[PDB]
A and B are shown apart, each in its own frame.
Chain A
Amino acid sequence: QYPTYSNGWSNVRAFVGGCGLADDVLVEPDTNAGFMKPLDGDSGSWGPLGPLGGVNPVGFTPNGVPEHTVAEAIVMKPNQPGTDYDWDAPTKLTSPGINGSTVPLPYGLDPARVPLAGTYTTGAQQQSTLVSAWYLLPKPDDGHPLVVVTAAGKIAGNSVLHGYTPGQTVVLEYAMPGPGALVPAGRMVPDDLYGEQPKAWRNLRFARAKMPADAVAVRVVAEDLSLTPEDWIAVTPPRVPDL
């Protein structure tokens, strides 16, 4: 846990000019940059769900999220102190989006530029699946250290303070350069923090330093094999933040 923040390292780093945690915390202003573009030059098989859906997106729908889904919180009945405005905003948008959704997106994502896909329905549950399109990947650097997918629902991923917190599947598999087919070559398990809060718009993150150096593309893979009405999934495309 070094060269990152610790008490003993910060105390001695404050001699030559140190700001405590304000040096190790990275912030993403204008979280609308870093969105990659689909490698697949086919505007064909992509149906009503877009490039995020891919081929046969069966189970997923643009308006597949419940009503009062907010970022990193769960809305309750009485007025709570020190809460965000998204607890009181209207439950829908007065316009569609790129997919055709009317869901308010968190963190400041522009619903007129960011699609969505969810597996929330009322009655007649089923086994869903989604395999996105190949999203090109920029040349690596030191300032861009991770890939991020904003998602809600019951998802299985690692974290500190909780071991595994099982659930459904989002794995963002990747590909390596080849003759021109781009067959997959691996999988990655996300690092979510709000694992015990399954409705939170929780911004899953995949470290770039784990996948190989020469990786050309990535794509999202989601399953939702559970037929419980409260076991659902929702995803947005992947992006590379600016930090």
Chain B
Amino acid sequence: FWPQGSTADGNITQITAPLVSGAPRALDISIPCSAIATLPANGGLVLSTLPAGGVDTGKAGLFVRANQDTVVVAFRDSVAAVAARSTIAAGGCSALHIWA
């Protein structure tokens, strides 16, 4: 489960768990929109299952990138849930729900 840490002032921490078989069996994720409405301008990496610095981590993992004007929920380089960023930070949505 996650968040399982805290680093001494709220601030849930990342974790590392390199799975041997690659993909998991189930991936119920959830993110509130009061948490996506707090990124700065140009946003960046709301959540991920791989670090964005590795070798070809785009076509392997899951990336929720909040760029300017949009929040794109990709997959193995296959967009699933583009959503505008002016209705997220307005009370238009409730929670981003991912499942695999």
Q: Which residues of A line the B interface, CB within 8 A?
A: 124-125, 127, 225-229, 231
The reply to whether the CB of B74 lies closer than 8 angstroms to some CB of chain A is: yes
User: What does the 1/0 interface line of B73-84 toward A look like (CB < 8 Å)?
Assistant: 010011100100
A-B contact list, 7 entries, CB within 8 Å: A124-B67, A125-B77, A225-B78, A225-B79, A227-B79, A229-B58, A231-B77
- Chain B contact residues, majority secondary structure: loop
Complex Cα distance A228/B58, Å?
A: 7
User: What does the 1/0 interface line of B45-61 toward A look like (CB < 8 Å)?
Assistant: 00000000000001100
Shortest CB-to-CB span from B65 to chain A, Å, is 9
Q: How many chain B residues touch A (Cβ–Cβ < 8 Å)?
A: 8
Q: Are A226 and B78 in contact (CB under 8 A)?
A: yes
- Chain A contact residues, majority secondary structure: loop
Complex Cα distance A230/B68, Å?
A: 23
Q: Are B67 and A228 in contact (CB under 8 A)?
A: no
Please indicate the chain B residues that have their CB under 8 angstroms from the CB of A125 in the complex. Answer: 77
Please indicate the chain A residues that have their CB under 8 angstroms from the CB of B58 in the complex. Answer: 227-229
Please indicate the chain B residues that have their CB under 8 angstroms from the CB of A228 in the complex. Answer: 58-59, 77
Complex Cα distance A124/B45, Å?
A: 13
Shortest CB-to-CB span from A168 to chain B, Å, is 13
Complex Cα distance A164/B55, Å?
A: 30
Please indicate the chain A residues that have their CB under 8 angstroms from the CB of B59 in the complex. Answer: 228
Q: Which residues of B line the A interface, CB within 8 A?
A: 58-59, 67, 74, 77-79, 82
Please indicate the chain A residues that have their CB under 8 angstroms from the CB of B77 in the complex. Answer: 125, 226-228, 231
Please indicate the chain A residues that have their CB under 8 angstroms from the CB of B67 in the complex. Answer: 124
Please indicate the chain B residues that have their CB under 8 angstroms from the CB of A124 in the complex. Answer: 67
Shortest CB-to-CB span from B79 to chain A, Å, is 6
Shortest CB-to-CB span from B57 to chain A, Å, is 12
- The chain A residue with its CB closest to the CB of B67 is A124
Shortest CB-to-CB span from B78 to chain A, Å, is 7
- The chain B residue with its CB closest to the CB of A226 is B77
- The chain A residue with its CB closest to the CB of B74 is A227
Shortest CB-to-CB span from A239 to chain B, Å, is 33
Complex Cα distance A228/B56, Å?
A: 9
Shortest CB-to-CB span from B52 to chain A, Å, is 11
- The chain B residue with its CB closest to the CB of A227 is B77
- The chain B residue with its CB closest to the CB of A229 is B58
- The chain A residue with its CB closest to the CB of B70 is A126
Please indicate the chain A residues that have their CB under 8 angstroms from the CB of B78 in the complex. Answer: 225-227
Please indicate the chain B residues that have their CB under 8 angstroms from the CB of A127 in the complex. Answer: 79, 82
Please indicate the chain A residues that have their CB under 8 angstroms from the CB of B74 in the complex. Answer: 227
Complex Cα distance A228/B77, Å?
A: 6
Shortest CB-to-CB span from B4 to chain A, Å, is 31
Please indicate the chain B residues that have their CB under 8 angstroms from the CB of A226 in the complex. Answer: 77-78
Shortest CB-to-CB span from A165 to chain B, Å, is 19
Complex Cα distance A227/B57, Å?
A: 12
Shortest CB-to-CB span from B83 to chain A, Å, is 14
Complex Cα distance A59/B12, Å?
A: 36
Please indicate the chain A residues that have their CB under 8 angstroms from the CB of B82 in the complex. Answer: 127
- The chain A residue with its CB closest to the CB of B82 is A127
Complex Cα distance A81/B74, Å?
A: 44
- The chain B residue with its CB closest to the CB of A127 is B79
- The chain A residue with its CB closest to the CB of B65 is A124
